[PDB]
Amino acid sequence: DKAAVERSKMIDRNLREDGEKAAREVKLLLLGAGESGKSTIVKQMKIIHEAGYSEEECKQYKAVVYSNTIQSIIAIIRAMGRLKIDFGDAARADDARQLFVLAGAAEEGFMTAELAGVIKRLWKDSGVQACFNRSREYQLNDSAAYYLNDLDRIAQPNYIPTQQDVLRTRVKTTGIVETHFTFKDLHFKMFDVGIHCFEGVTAIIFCVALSDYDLVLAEDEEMNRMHESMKLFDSICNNKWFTDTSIILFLNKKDLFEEKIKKSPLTICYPEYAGSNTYEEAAAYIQCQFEDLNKRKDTKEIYTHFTCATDTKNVQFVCDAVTDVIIKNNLKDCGLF
Ligand SMILES: Nc1nc2c(ncn2[C@@H]2O[C@H](COP(=O)(O)OP(=O)(O)O)[C@@H](O)[C@H]2O)c(=O)[nH]1
Ligand SMILES: O=S([O-])[O-]
Ligand SMILES: [Cl-]
């Protein structure tokens, strides 16, 4: 372990009466465009380092799971009208009407056997599936298929959200969330911000949704999501405040990216791309595109990881590697408390 050797060279604890018990602090700034996976990484730190989610905690997310599911099916059904896609079975038109009747009369996310039946039959329909497969043409929750394929379980009367159900939720974050966890005897203070108050943070973790490459901003249908993310990364990576800050890049949603890359060409995002349309070549190209935005290459190193933030095991592996980089490079700028 090169990290253990490196940290063992520190002598600053000796200057403190109870130095060996002192807390070494690491501040991590968590950045990235909306829906890039920041809240999910936050949830994973709780799961991995601070004892997960109990069942009662999971229970609080029940109506969030229903809400996300309701939103997803409605977005697809509504898109069918705008894209002129017919139901595969004309009998589904009644189910579609009933979806709006049921969502329309409720105060918040909910589930009944009646609604489940409605959504289940809609989700199985060939025309709905065809609309689903053109989701790049509208705005659809990335977790749509996850919840809709598991609808039968979610619809059971004594349904209890699993940890993965909770990780899969999309929750509207406003403002700054700060989380604390201890790992490898470091006391991490993680800020979900998505900025001069964080000058001289130990490290930045910047999240990018790989699967955004063929999508558009909800605000401006003309604006390519990935180009927006690059511009944001450019504006962060080359900012005065962050020269001694380790810049970590999470190229996230690699699972979703791998699934669509065969069907939908990278050229939609990068017209000049002439590589093959495979997971390997297209992901590499995106990595190179982002790392290129760094204007101080022989000064600043970018530490890139491909992540699936909903996958606890991958996030645990990636977190472990990122932490070794910080221990090897940044401890001299981390204070004791
Ligand atoms: N399949 C998949 N879904 C993800 C991944 N990362 C995040 N999500 C989902 O994408 C949605 C948005 O992620 P979120 O953490 O809320 O993004 P934020 O706006 O940056 O906080 C949530 O529904 C997550 O469950 C991933 O790597 N793979
Ligand atoms: O001194 S180091 O081990 O935090
Ligand atoms: Cl999403």
Side-chain angles (χ1 to χ4, degrees), residues 1-194 197-337:
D1 190 10
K2 197 249 178 192
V5 166
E6 274 303 305
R7 84 189 289 173
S8 302
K9 307 176 175 174
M10 293 302 284
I11 55 167
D12 61 343
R13 292 179 180 271
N14 296 298
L15 280 297
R16 306 180 61 99
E17 182 145 39
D18 288 312
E20 294 309 314
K21 295 177 179 178
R24 166 102 53 200
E25 289 195 5
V26 175
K27 293 189 178 172
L28 293 179
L29 178 53
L30 188 56
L31 303 182
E35 293 153 32
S36 62
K38 300 179 307 288
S39 288
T40 309
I41 294 300
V42 173
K43 287 191 172 53
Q44 292 286 23
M45 298 296 103
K46 168 176 195 204
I47 290 181
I48 296 161
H49 301 302
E50 306 287 313
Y53 283 78
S54 69
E55 276 201 357
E56 199 66 22
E57 290 171 322
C58 287
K59 282 176 164 176
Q60 303 283 61
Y61 283 84
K62 253 180 60 177
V64 184
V65 171
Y66 301 151
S67 179
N68 279 184
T69 300
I70 290 166
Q71 178 176 37
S72 297
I73 188 56
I74 284 181
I76 309 167
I77 300 314
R78 185 171 281 128
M80 289 180 83
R82 297 134 62 209
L83 299 181
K84 315 285 185 182
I85 304 175
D86 300 317
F87 288 115
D89 186 328
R92 292 307 137 258
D94 293 333
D95 282 331
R97 183 200 51 232
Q98 195 62 17
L99 172 63
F100 286 99
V101 172
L102 289 177
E107 345 164 46
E108 67 179 40
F110 71 100
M111 193 51 57
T112 59
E114 183 193 358
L115 180 59
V118 163
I119 296 177
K120 195 160 316 192
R121 297 186 296 274
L122 287 169
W123 183 235
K124 276 188 168 66
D125 179 85
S126 64
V128 177
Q129 280 302 308
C131 191
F132 171 67
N133 294 326
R134 298 166 57 188
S135 60
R136 68 173 290 268
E137 301 185 44
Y138 51 101
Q139 303 289 326
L140 184 57
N141 308 41
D142 283 336
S143 289
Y146 173 89
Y147 289 131
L148 289 165
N149 289 334
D150 279 36
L151 181 58
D152 176 72
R153 169 178 65 88
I154 289 150
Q156 291 308 310
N158 306 297
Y159 168 59
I160 297 180
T162 58
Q163 268 192 354
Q164 178 71 192
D165 293 345
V166 174
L167 287 165
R168 288 284 187 150
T169 60
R170 186 163 82 195
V171 166
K172 181 187 282 184
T173 296
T174 60
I176 297 173
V177 195
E178 171 180 350
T179 328
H180 292 188
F181 62 92
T182 297
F183 180 46
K184 295 182 176 179
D185 208 34
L186 302 175
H187 301 238
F188 286 83
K189 314 301 168 200
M190 180 181 269
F191 301 89
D192 178 358
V193 169
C197 303
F198 307 97
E199 54 180 318
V201 281
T202 317
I204 281 167
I205 296 173
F206 191 95
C207 302
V208 175
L210 286 167
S211 50
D212 279 6
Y213 73 89
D214 69 353
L215 306 171
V216 299
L217 277 180
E219 319 175 317
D220 200 318
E221 87 205 306
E222 309 291 330
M223 297 318 143
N224 177 280
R225 278 182 180 239
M226 184 117 85
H227 298 161
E228 290 291 279
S229 182
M230 298 176 63
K231 189 164 102 291
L232 174 64
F233 183 72
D234 191 8
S235 177
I236 286 302
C237 192
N238 308 293
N239 190 327
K240 269 196 176 182
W241 311 134
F242 304 135
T243 74
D244 295 273
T245 305
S246 296
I247 308 278
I248 304 146
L249 179 60
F250 283 1
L251 296 177
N252 190 45
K253 295 182 173 192
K254 61 179 191 181
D255 62 318
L256 297 183
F257 180 78
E258 178 177 4
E259 296 166 357
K260 72 164 57 181
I261 190 55
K262 4 157 164 277
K263 310 141 180 168
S264 176
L266 185 53
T267 48
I268 300 163
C269 182
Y270 301 106
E272 82 284 359
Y273 178 65
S276 293
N277 269 304
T278 54
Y279 182 39
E280 293 75 14
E281 297 194 34
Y285 192 82
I286 295 167
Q287 175 170 358
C288 294
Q289 291 298 124
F290 274 84
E291 297 185 342
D292 235 276
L293 302 168
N294 175 44
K295 301 160 148 205
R296 298 303 319 186
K297 293 183 179 68
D298 32 35
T299 290
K300 189 168 271 308
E301 191 95 10
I302 307 297
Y303 305 88
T304 299
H305 295 86
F306 285 83
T307 63
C308 170
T310 50
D311 181 337
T312 297
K313 285 181 200 170
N314 178 241
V315 173
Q316 181 172 38
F317 178 85
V318 169
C319 184
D320 174 89
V322 162
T323 294
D324 281 354
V325 172
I326 291 165
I327 293 174
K328 292 175 184 180
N329 296 127
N330 309 74
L331 288 191
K332 290 167 165 55
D333 300 316
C334 297
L336 295 168
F337 294 83

